[PDB]
Amino acid sequence: SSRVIVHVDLDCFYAQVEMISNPELKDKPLGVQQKYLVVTCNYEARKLGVKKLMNVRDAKEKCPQLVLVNGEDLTRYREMSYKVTELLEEFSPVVERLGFDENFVDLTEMVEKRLQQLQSDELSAVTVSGHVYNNQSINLLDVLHIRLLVGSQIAAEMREAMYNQLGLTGCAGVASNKLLAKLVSGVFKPNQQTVLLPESCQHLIHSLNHIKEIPGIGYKTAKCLEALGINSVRDLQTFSPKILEKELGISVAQRIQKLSFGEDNSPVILSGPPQSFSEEDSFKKCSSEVEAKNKIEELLASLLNRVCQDGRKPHTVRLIIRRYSSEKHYGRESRQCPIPSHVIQVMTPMVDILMKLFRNMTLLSVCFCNLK
DNA sequence: AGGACCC
DNA sequence: TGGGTCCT
Numbered sequence: 525s526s527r528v529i530v531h532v533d534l535d536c537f538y539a540q541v542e543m544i545s546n547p548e549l550k551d552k553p554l555g556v557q558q559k560y561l562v563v564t565c566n567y568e569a570r571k572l573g574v575k576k577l578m579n580v581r582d583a584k585e586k587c588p589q590l591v592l593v594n595g596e597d598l599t600r601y602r603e604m605s606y607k608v609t610e611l612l613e614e615f616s617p618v619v620e621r622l623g624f625d626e627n628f629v630d631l632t633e634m635v636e637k638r639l640q641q642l643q644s645d646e647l648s649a650v651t652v653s654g655h656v657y658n659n660q661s662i663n664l665l666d667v668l669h670i671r672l673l674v675g676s677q678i679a680a681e682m683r684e685a686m687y688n689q690l691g692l693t694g695c696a697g698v699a700s701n702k703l704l705a706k707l708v709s710g711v712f713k714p715n716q717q718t719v720l721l722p723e724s725c726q727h728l729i730h731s732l733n734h735i736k737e738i739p740g741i742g743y744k745t746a747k748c749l750e751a752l753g754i755n756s757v758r759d760l761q762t763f764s765p766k767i768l769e770k771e772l773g774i775s776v777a778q779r780i781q782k783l784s785f786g787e788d789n790s791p792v793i794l795s796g797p798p799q800s801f802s803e804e805d806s807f808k809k810c811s812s813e814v815e816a817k818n819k820i821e822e823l824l825a826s827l828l829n830r831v832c833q834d835g836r837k838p839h840t841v842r843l844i845i846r847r848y849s850s851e852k853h854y855g856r857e858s859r860q861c862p863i864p865s866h867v868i869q870v871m872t873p874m875v876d877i878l879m880k881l882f883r884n885m886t887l888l889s890v891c892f893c894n895l896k
Numbered sequence: 897a898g899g900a901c902c903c
Numbered sequence: 904t905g906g907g908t909c910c911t
Contacts, residue, residue, distance in 0.1 A: 537903090558905065577904080598905060623903030623907075742901045795908095804905050858897070889905085 526668060528631045528675040529792060531705035532612065532682065534694040535715055537625040538601050539566040542593045544691055545600070553587055556595035559806060563595060567714060596805075598624075599826075607690055609795070615682055621795040628702055629682075630792040635674045653680035654696070654717035657708055658724045668722055672698055676719040683717060703788035704728065706739050725786040732757050740783050748772060760784035797895075801830050801838070804889035809848045811888065820878055823890045824871060831892045837868050840894035843878055846887040858891075859884050 534540065538556040543549045543566060553569030555562040562583045565574045573586040584590055595601070605624035612627050613619045620628040642650075648664055653676040656662065663669050679696040686692045696717035697709025707728055708720040720728060732738060735757060736746040752771070754760050761784045769777040782788065803823045811819070820843070831838055844858040859881040867873045878890065 533903095561904065563905085579904095596905075602906085621907090625903065739902080744900060793908095799908065800906095802906070806904075854899085856898080860897070887905095 526632075526671070527700055528635045528671050529699060529702055529705045530629050530631050530675060530679045530682070531697040531699075531702070531709040532608075532627045532629070532679075532686075532694055533696070533706075533709045534608065534625040534686075534692060536564045536566055536570075537605075538564045538595050540692055541601055541604050542595070546593075549591060549593070553590050555583060555590050555592050557592045558594070558596050562590075562592070565590070604690070604692070608686060608692065611685060611689060612682060615678065615685075618792050618794050620792045626706075628705065628792045631675050631678055631698075634678060635671050638674050638678075639670065650674065652719060653677045654719065655712050657711055657718050657720045658727050660721045660724045662721070668700075672700070672719050672721060676717065679717050679719075683715075701786075701788045702790055702792060703739055703783055704786055707732075729757050729784070729786045735760050735780075735784070738780070738783055740788070741780055745772065745776070745780065757784055797834065797836070799895065800891055800893040801827055801834070802889055802891035802893075803827055804844075804887055806846070806887040809886045811886070816888075817879060817882060819888055820882070820890060821871065821875060823888065824874060824878070827890055827892055828870065828874075834895075836895045838892035838895050839863055839868065840892070841874070841878065841881075842891040842893065843881050843885070844887070844889045844891065845885055848886050857885055 539554050542556055543554060551568060553566065553572055553574065555565035555569050555574055557563070557580065560580050562574060562578050562580060564576050569587060569590055574583055574590060601624055609619055609621055609627055612629050616629055616631060616634050618630045622628065647670065650664065650670055650673050652662065652673045662673065675698040679698050683694060683696055686694060693715035695709050695713065695715065697705045697720070699705040699708055699720040700722065704720050704725065708718050711718040734755060735741050735749055738757070748771070749760065754763050760781060765781065768781060803826055805819065805823065839862060840860065841863050842858050842860045844856050846856060861881055864873070867877070
């Protein structure tokens, strides 16, 4: 019936990794750069105006002192990301990754086992760990409150472990489903945690300022809802099911309307090993359609070392590209093809293997998928 | 192959 | 605007 889900969200992840590499970067405003962008920065620099995904220029003309480290090679970020996930899996096996810095853990079973260990007395001593959303009063006789509180305790144990064993700080949100857990994890933003009691669900959902802010409603859907006059969470909650169903599909429509009410029955999915491996690269439009495949040889280099390490082998390869011109807000192409059973068991072959797929066709990326 | 959505 | 996942 009722679940206890925790959402773990690491603070400015790349920055934390770069700060751990070179300690001299601490306290000093740090920004991690990829090409001409500052993807993320530590809180210090953030205090000085630096915002995530901001042009270097606008970043230095806002903080003419900001230090920058290149973060185009995701290798170390990716490695730490899995150590975090594995550490969480130790607490409970059902852990879902969302990007490199977020994880969802279904704590339901763990909470039950812990509660069954408590005696008819110490159950009244159950306390919360961290913040209680909207400073809501706890009712120790509400079984749902007790469960979420134990959930807050586990969350605190997880964050303490991440810090002690891995040197990382982060936020956590504890709630009855993934939607709410993710929305509440960020209420007290820096290295802290919050728990959501049922009675405050509407307050949390309505605290949002636009449907776009709801996890599960992307750039597209948002614009669709807008063209319909739906802008606030309450608009969506009160809109006609039928029309919404008749314009977004019965699937999408019924799902996002549930979300507007803070309802979300999606299960936390066990991520396990990656379903694919890939590396990209965007050039200043410097690929003459030919000879510029030496770049593809570079991508393959690292990948091959990665595809290797994992142990499993990929039975499919792919190549994706881009083209410069107008304002193509969306434009990618890729030629998918099977990988020779013999070559699976090295570059040379694969090189021209991608080369043919090449000709058949500002960015270039090789993706090894269909792992077995 | 391409699309939507997410960090 | 460097990676990923799942659905059509």
